[PDB]
Subunit: 250 residues, 6 copies
């Protein structure tokens, strides 16, 4: 009630100025947990949010939920309240043979395959991650023992029919797409997400800092299938990483 | 469970082959209250699945979530299960002046201002509604008495920039959208929304009937807003028309 | 079909674990009236059972009665079904001079002036509010403006003597409770009620969440008369608070 | 408007001075109708007040609710309006082999195993019924042709935690209530109910006449199956007795 | 020099209004050695006391002596001097087989099994603890990730002739303590200590805030007793806690 | 390496079967000095043991410490150590307007205002002293020619309210004691100490003898500005006495 969707007043941030924003409310409480004073702040549509304390400081944990459009809202919504640094988080599947399940990727920039990012800046402008927000992550990952990685991620507007795949009802991909996983695999792209380009682009084009840290929970181009526990735990290695990094970014 | 999100068995519809689909999951129960003997099929995350008889026919309601990608996930799986026809109902703003708060707008075709629909069809192909679905919706509307307007709508992939909004954080509109609304506001286009672009295209091009009704929550060119109850006008006028419509197309 | 005094079964709860509890059964219809999925379940004895949904989860608002001998019944009748949390809401008079009519009052532990509780534990053991449900209430109550105080309460097995009241038939109080209120005031107790002693005492000793909040419908030490709605509205706060605190526990 | 909880206006009893106070309102009704001009007055919480008449004199019938604290108000609130002679009637099971599931008992005094009596007179004080009220009764039952019983009654504050029963969410049977039932028998106790030691006590210690008669729907002292033919019968007879009894008492 | 017992004087506090009261006279050193410019003030019977400075303000710390009777003197004479908030820290053993030798517990309220606590409030009043103090201690233990626990502690006035110790001269206690561990256990008690009760009870009922925190040195429940390097961390953890806490409560 | 809190063995006490225990350790030195061969033996918490001799037989001193729970500890272990007779010198305050400041009291038995003794024997059992240990005191008190006063005391678990002191921080004293000093005064009790109870009751219920003597350091009800010089000598004699007193009991 000062911004919509989120349903939060500027007084609900207790003076905060930074938000960690995953894309799922099941991580919000998990995330907020790893800190102290997590007084659930609200839940209003698909934008479920809390509020915690870190080094005696205000830091929020709000989600996104599939779709750069969906995302574009929460961040702007948030940003107009007080926040001005959107550390993101999440797991994923990489497209490189040398990259393992247990390693964590830190996205420097992204392939703008989404369509949403096109509302804050032309395509010639890059979906670039903030410098400090990138080093802060690498550190936080440089210190727990997580095989760090750094590069570019493809940010496409689709799960099955978009992300270059051929398993569904019909059996195709949009012309200009048909066979895109391969090509990127040759430009040194690491993973396949779906919100980064919007984020990076909508922060980079609007004088706002943001960083990204995922967690390889499976590598499609390899025999060996992942594991429940590995996935369960690994998921948390990514939790700590960012949680721990945000402190320096305050 | 045969899907990947909706979490429903193909036997869960018990006949169902149509489906009213709103973005907000909250309304799913609101909508399915109107039919006869309803039931909550399930409701994982932003994918609330309610079912409800209507003229002895097994009809269904389901949420879309915000954004075209989120949408793509619903419809694709819903169609997978057994549906062949959709019907979207929502809230929105009307750009034209002569349009009013608490009115119904039908859409025969949408301007593609996203990047989700592109995965199913080139930008030449049109975001067109379906006759069958336009028929009822228009009739069912003139049937319950509602100042009805019919035409074209812009389905922006963003709520703030794509729909040209300066009442924001930065107050800037990338060259592209600088003046788009004022320009739209002469091509005849009536309103702004976010999921029609992906719904119409993908359906129109997959042998699946679909249409889309909605109501005006606000006319922004206007300033003297509606009122809470005016907000419940749609929550009945537009809500009844889509069911009124659902019936005829049974 | 499941229990006796209620007439509910492990299917009327839609699998739940929490539940509200207003002693008066004519308040149940108003608790749920504030929550999505509001449906009426029965009307036995004084246990007017109702159900609802808060954030897509099942919540079982239910009523107790005057005293802890009935509440005895209510609590276990519910838990046995599958409830592991309870949040009492109610009516109360304040002994402290500075607590005003309306002011929502939360509790930490009630002074054992009942009898039922003595059947679940010794008088040495403390009728303590579960830290879990006590925090929730205080947040909600506080993140809404509610003028709150948190402290000690006096759970009497009677409404006139066990709470010093002379405007009666006789006009006398048995040695024991003679001048007690006075001492409680010095002792810094907050208010008078009749159900929290059992409830609290009861759950603690059995491994069950339990918290409690109520509303100032009357103060004695003071002058002013009972207003209008602030004897139904004075509840409004508590009513909502016990609900905004509801969400948080789900 | 004259009495907080019940509503009753001193002008609603019209010089009556007796009042049969049953458990639930359903029993309050089958009673009113047997006397004359049974008129309804009001119904709040577990308190439903009817108005009858016997031989040109006013009489009141009001439900009291479960527990000694519940009753605590029914009385004082009535006794505050004009009533001075109270009579209790309900149903119970027996503990003495020499009692069949069709008898009627009368309580001269009750073992105080409650908590709301201590709010009226030290445990040294007896919970004995008046002599007139307890004479009218012993006569009324001999009349109709019943098999009376005049003795002492167990007035527990809860169920199993103080009656040697168990199965439920096992609620600790206070170390004090170990080897209770068997010892209650050896001390010539007839039944077991839950509000008499609280009714009789607040009376005698204040200047009021109360009496107690009840039928035996069950007699767990044996495994010999119980016929509902008796259940409805026993009921009516008992009520007849009291209503006949009251005739004298007026 | 001001107080007949402690010794300290109004002056020797420097406006301080919060004191950490550990039992032993050493711990006091351990603590105080953590704030700014520690300074001994007095050492008289079993009441040694220093003065510190935390986050800018003046603070106190002070040994209590065995049992609550000893505590009773300190607490009072401290409060008399100016101390309004207290905070206890000690050791103990678990009753639950799930509590571990490295865990820490905060007490909401304790089963009053002492005797001295009876010179303040009746046996009904609870051994409840100030809401904030209690919260202040759950955060601290958290702000440093500890195998934390929260709930009720048991505290009598004896070591071996009481707290289930069939080991001394007589080999048992009166008919009160005779297989009670098993008892309180079944009711959910975390530990056994002696000064807790008295403290909480005396405080709540006077107008002061007090918190109770401890650490499990011996896993008495189990066949256990730890060494000399762990009987040190237990303290470092607890010390950093009640200190970290006190900071906030300041 | 024998018993913790004390820290003493057996070869440690040269047979010593009787022992003097004067609460305060700082006064242990100046007692052992009165008997023969005064040798120090330990110093732990307050339990400061000191070996000495008399007439060729061993006698030990071991200050107990404020409160009964303390003493409880000390005595329980000395006893394990061999001791089997205890004399308890200490100070006190009289409540009679005939006993001056410096008088010497001898206790036959005292009031049980403690709480520890309940672990040693029912409240009914008396808190009396051995007879040999009582004549031993008296006579020797006559011996040095000291103004004696045989009688009874009141043993309080707490020093401020236990003995109705209003000049506290809350200026409040619970019900059980409000005006508790005139009840005693009139009753015929002479002093108010804090350890006499556990001692006597604890000893008189196992087989050990015990005694009690104290010097009047402060007469409550009294005033008449206490003459400076008299207060030390006050404690002096009552020391000489016990030492000498202990003479006959060897």
């Amino acid at each position: 009630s000062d911004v919509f969707h989120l349903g939060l007043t500027k007084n609900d941030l207790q003076g905060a100025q930074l938000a960690i924003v995953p894309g799922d409310p099941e991580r919000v409480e998990k995330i907020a947990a790893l800190m102290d004073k997590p007084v659930k702040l609200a839940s209003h549509r698909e934008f479920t949010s809390w509020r915690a304390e870190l080094d005696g400081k205000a830091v929020i944990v709000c989600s996104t939920g599939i779709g750069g459009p969906s995302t574009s809202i929460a961040v702007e919504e948030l940003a107009q309240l007080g926040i001005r640094t959107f550390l993101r988080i999440g797991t994923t599947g990489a497209i490189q043979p040398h990259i393992n399940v247990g390693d964590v990727l830190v996205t420097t920039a992204s392939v703008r395959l989404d369509g949403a990012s096109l509302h804050f800046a032309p395509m010639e402008f890059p979906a670039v991650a903030d410098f400090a927000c990138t080093t802060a992550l690498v550190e936080a990952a440089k210190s727990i023992g997580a095989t760090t990685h750094v590069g570019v991620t493809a940010s496409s507007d689709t799960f099955y029919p978009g992300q270059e795949r051929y398993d569904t009802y019909s059996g195709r991909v949009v012309r200009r797409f048909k066979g895109s996983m391969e090509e990127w695999q040759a430009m040194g792209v690491m993973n396949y997400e779906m919100e980064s380009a919007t984020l990076l682009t909508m922060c980079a084009s609007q004088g706002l800092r943001a960083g990204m840290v995922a967690g390889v929970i499976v590598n499609r181009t390899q025999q060996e299938i992942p594991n429940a526990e590995t996935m369960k735990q690994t998921e948390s290695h990514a939790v700590k990483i960012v949680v721990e990094a945000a402190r320096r970014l305050l």
